[PDB]
Design brief:
The structure is cut from a larger assembly and holds chains A and B.
Chain A: H1 3-9, E1 29-39, E2 49-56, E3 61-65, E4 79-81
Antiparallel strand pairs in A: 1-2, 1-4, 2-3
Chain B: H1 5-18, E1 23-27, H2 30-41, E2 47-53, E3 56-62, E4 83-85, E5 94-95, E6 112-114, E7 117-119, H3 121-126, E8 131-132, E9 135-137
Antiparallel strand pairs in B: 1-3, 2-3, 4-9, 5-8, 6-7
The chains are: A mainly beta, B alpha+beta.
Chain A binds four RNA strands through residues 1-8, 10-14, 18, 20, 22, 24-30, 37, 39-49, 57, 63, 67-70, 80-84, 86-88, 90-91, 95, 97, 100, 108-115, 120.
Amino acid sequence: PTINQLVRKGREKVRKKSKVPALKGAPFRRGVCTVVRTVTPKKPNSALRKVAKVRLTSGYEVTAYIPGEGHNLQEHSVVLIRGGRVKDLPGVRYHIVRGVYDAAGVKDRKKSRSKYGTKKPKEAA
Amino acid sequence: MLTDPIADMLTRIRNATRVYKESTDVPASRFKEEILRILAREGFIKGYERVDVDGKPYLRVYLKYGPRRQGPDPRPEQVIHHIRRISKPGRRVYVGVKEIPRVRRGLGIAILSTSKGVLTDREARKLGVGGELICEVW
RNA sequence: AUUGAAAUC
RNA sequence: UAGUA
RNA sequence: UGAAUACGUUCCCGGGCCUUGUACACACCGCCCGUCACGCCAUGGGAGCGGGCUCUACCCGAAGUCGCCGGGAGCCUACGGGCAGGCGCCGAGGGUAGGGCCCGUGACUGGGGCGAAGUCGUAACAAGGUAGCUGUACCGGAAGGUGCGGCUGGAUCUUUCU
RNA sequence: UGUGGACCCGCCCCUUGGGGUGUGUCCAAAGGGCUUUGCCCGCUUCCGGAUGGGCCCGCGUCCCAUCAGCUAGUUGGUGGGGUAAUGGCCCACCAAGGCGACGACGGGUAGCCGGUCUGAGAGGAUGGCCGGCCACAGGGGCACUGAGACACGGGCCCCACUCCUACGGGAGGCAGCAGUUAGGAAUCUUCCGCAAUGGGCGCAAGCCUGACGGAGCGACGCCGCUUGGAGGAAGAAGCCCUUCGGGGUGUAAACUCCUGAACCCGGGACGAAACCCCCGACGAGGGGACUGACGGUACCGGGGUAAUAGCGCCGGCCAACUCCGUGCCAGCAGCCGCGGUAAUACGGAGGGCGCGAGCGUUACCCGGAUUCACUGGGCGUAAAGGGCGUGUAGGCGGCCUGGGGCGUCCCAUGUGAAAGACCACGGCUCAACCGUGGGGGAGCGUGGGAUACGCUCAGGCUAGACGGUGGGAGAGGGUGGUGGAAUUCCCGGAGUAGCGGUGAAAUGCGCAGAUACCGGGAGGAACGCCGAUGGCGAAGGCAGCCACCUGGUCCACCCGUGACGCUGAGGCGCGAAAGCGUGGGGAGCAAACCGGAUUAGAUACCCGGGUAGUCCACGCCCUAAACGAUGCGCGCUAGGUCUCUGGGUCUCCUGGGGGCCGAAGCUAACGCGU
């Protein structure tokens, strides 16, 4: 564009927006479950992928994924959401933090332990 | 009519040299002359001279190249590899003496118009004056 | 059973 | 008919 | 012991070289479009009940500053004036009526996105089997079909589906 | 009492209400203590100083134009009110103004800065802590006191709320420090001390100070330090692999020496010398006394124990690989992608890589992203040229001279507080932290100076543009008129059994005599050959022939004017086909529709019919593969060849168009290439 043009019009800050309405910035949000289901994934994958619907203290209601190999979550469970999508489950854009509130850590979990919220075992100690 | 007589000139020169013409005209202005003498003095053109063609004043600019080169494509190296207008009528450009640019670790030059007159960058640095950053060559 | 399946006996 | 070069 | 027949290369099948077009490369047993059906998701129109901001007009108007009175109608007086008190203008706000705007809910309702193997066909890609796209206009379960004009970003001197 | 000052008036200087002077008027005061006749703390009026403020102006300061028009104290005036003071700040009256695309009005969002983070930089993002300014003190008004307020812990009234209540009426305001509660993913002790610094009052002694100075809590951040040091096998066991010999964890451990974080005892701060007293003179100077929260902490000396390691990762990007388990399951996944019985990608173990009192995760900001491109990008086919013009504001402007010095440049000077950043040196054992010093700097003000470029003013010039005269080609447009071919229909002659249509048929039409043939007539629409790779137009678009009205354009002469130029947001005009309104017209064709076929079906392709429409007048509609998918103008940069139209010396030259091939160059390529 001519300079006169730029002078008349300027440029424009593209500022594309949040992938996570966990509202008020909020690195995490607290929520209560509503529905714990199981979901068929997509694209080229197959498995019974676990996931919850959550009523949010931000006023929102979102499906959030339940990581870990097995879980203790039913209807009125009250949980903490962390964000991070699934990818194979379209429309799932938040994860549940394991080991906070009524969502237990994962049992018999030895490797990537701080994720999955599983305390240090003393079995080798 | 012509929108930038100076820029047109730099171009006429640019265009002539790439087909290796021995000479070019450019219609004549005193300000054009003043730029030419720099190119001349600083070794980019063999020289200019005034002529009147079809009854009107032009400046015949005599271009200057290298030796016929070796392998496939013997075309000579250009003496003027890069002549470029800076302060166009659209966006006028002015450096003060502190901001006068040094074209190409010195191997270049920047014709630059001041109240002390049309100057190279070192000339103007030495005279201690800034002005309209006209163009640059190398 | 067939091919890893879906379908199908 | 889905995954698969 | 011992035939018949081959003009010919249009057609069926398999193949060879050149060239073209291609949205194919799992390579035409390829690709691919739309309705309908199922499931998650966000969204649009929406009469009426409700929540607020705002504008104009008319009326009521606290506190207070200011203005007038301040009397044979009260208190002080050196009679000059002061104070109480009273009236008024403005004025936070409020009420009545009328427009403009936002929030929510909202039965009925329009489509849209996404979802390993559901349904009907076969629009498009090879001249895709009626060249295709296109503005418009009418029509049809669905892709679409036709009309008028335009474009080349078309090859060429009997029948669907994987 | 009037040093003096205030006010009216006059005059002088000076220039907005600044200083001076002269009659007239008006205005002061407070006392207290003693080391009581001589000092101290105060009082009054005035001029000045320092400090702190009020007000005004230039420039700068986010998002939406899907906010384009706003405005009655509105804009100005005159006179008043009001204030410390200007001012529509407020009031009375007069005038009719003021603001807006350079974005007013409206909506959304937001305290602003020094600076902070990030970036090579330009820039982006940000404004917590510290410093400056501002604004608020449950929400809304308001005034009083006073040097100062329209006052967080002052006042009055309305509102909501909480408590008291004899229901008449009252009380209150942590966004001070703590702490409670609620919201939340989340944020501390109802701590010590006025010892220091600082503030208030006081002559002083002192009193007050949740400012402050400290301790507390929280890996929340930065820095320092610890979990040992040196020996120690061809290498214990255990576990992991294994081709069954072997390989690994691994000098790692065990074990021997050595030092000695923690912990014990001893000692023990600087931070604090002033105000005060005495001497001197309540001055200068000299002397003395009191006082430490942190704290029995820091630091010093002695003793002394081998004394904590986790978290992430190992398919590619990216540094690190084997074995089981699992079988599109369970699960992983930042992107690309892993898992369907041999998975370096899942879960586990061994091993390895990376960090280390941390390591990961999520959120947000800068980066990379030249991915809003000022530095620093683009639009033939990738996203991107407006369907075409006309010309409004706006941007941009040929050659020569002179004036002005607005842009621009140079010199000096003022400002740019502190902190921070940066360089040095220094103080805590280092560092983090801190201190002292130094160095720059845009930007803006003031004075001076330069004049090349840009601007402006005044002249000039003719190469750009426009014009003059002469000549040219043209489906350029508008209006009327006219011509021949063909189709359909009507009339006549003649003539007879079919025509038509298809792949093949059938619907259809035909003895009320069609088709084929000849003659006459009516009507509509379109113009064969010329016709082109051609011409015109700004596009859309334009095609028989004639006449009139009219636009553009090209050449030659080189005659006129003198830069009159280019572009163009908005505006306005034009704008194929389809479509809409009113009214005509209606041959042929033909969406829809009615039939016949075909087909698995066939709302289609083929056949037979057929309404709107196509044609005209007027008014709408304003779209398109409105395509060269290429905006306008100008200068410059090899040629060959075909062609339309001018001019000239006419094998060639010279203009203006239309095409192809192609120099240089360009392009991702295809291509583009006077």
